[PDB]
Amino acid sequence: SKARVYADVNVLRPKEYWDYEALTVQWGEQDDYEVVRKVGRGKYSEVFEGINVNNNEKCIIKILKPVKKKKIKREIKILQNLCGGPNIVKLLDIVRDQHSKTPSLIFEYVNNTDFKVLYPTLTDYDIRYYIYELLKALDYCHSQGIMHRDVKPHNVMIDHELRKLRLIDWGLAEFYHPGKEYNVRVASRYFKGPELLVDLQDYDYSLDMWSLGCMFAGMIFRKEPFFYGHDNHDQLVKIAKVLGTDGLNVYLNKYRIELDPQLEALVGRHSRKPWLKFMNADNQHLVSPEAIDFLDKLLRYDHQERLTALEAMTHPYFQQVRAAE
Ligand SMILES: N#C/C(=C\c1ccc(O)c(O)c1)C(N)=O
Secondary structure, three states: OOOOOOOOOHHHHHHHHHHHHHHOOOOOHHHHHHEEEEEEOOOOOEEEEEEEEOOOOOOEEEEEEOHHHHHHHHHHHHHHHOOOOEEEEEEEEEEOOOOOOOOEEEEEOOOOHHHHHHHHHHHHHHHHHHHHHHHHHHHHHOOOOOEEOOOHHHHHEEOOOOOOEEOOOOOOOOOOOOOOOOOOOOOHHHHOOOHOOOOOOOOOOHHHHHHHHHHHHHHOOOOOEEEEEEOOHHHHHHHHHHHOHHHHHHHHHOOOOOOHHHHHHHHHOOOOOOHHHHHOOOHHOOOHHHHHHHHEEEEEEEEOOOOOHHHHHHHHHHHHHHHHO
């Protein structure tokens, strides 16, 4: 399998563009930035609202938990490549504590409203608009040869007053190289594509479009997360209990993957459930024919059949957002 778009971006650029192991970091000044308050955390980082002591402007201090130096240069190299891209978080500086050489990444600050509080607030138009702003970031980073591999609401910062969106936490992002077999232990479980759950390792940018579809279904159906598996086997069962197992079988046969017998028995056999079966009084105002048609074209087993980010942006679901632009 091979990406249908942007497959050659890294082939044609000089090796220094994608050769992140060879990057040499020019370290800033650790004392330029002071922690104000903790803002977030994850397996690999703690994140703080900071202040730039020179201009007194806010910033984000991302202190990286101890990991292999490779993962560090990878995130830095990707952030440098994407800086200036539409709705990509801007890496401002890189610093380290002198005694322990623990590195910190400095970013612009987004006055985010956490999605668990923000999303139930959003109007139908607001959903269209913010998903459109996210699509801009994905099309750009795909066009620059990079897969984010961790799309989820936790990684989309939104200042709802300024209507500003940033795609954050590029610590799992990776360069796309046609034919390369990647680690399927990426993304967060509820947003892993089927390709990750059946150990199809030569995936591509289209993985991010499944994750986006999961996010989007969660928003319009107000079912968060939309596919709620307990572990990685269960997560595929939950998908197959919606898309149907017939579609799963042709996917597996087309890319010549056999499921593990334990996983195969767990999936069983299920007919496809139409998207309207998730509508209720609460989400009804958000579930129009165009939203459904758009969601249907993201959540396909076959990663080659899903919309690209560029195609998604032209879907008639977004026509009113494009017209405002
Ligand atoms: N949280 C948070 C925020 C920013 C951020 C920026 C880059 C990252 O890699 C990251 O994990 C977080 C924020 N509210 O602006």
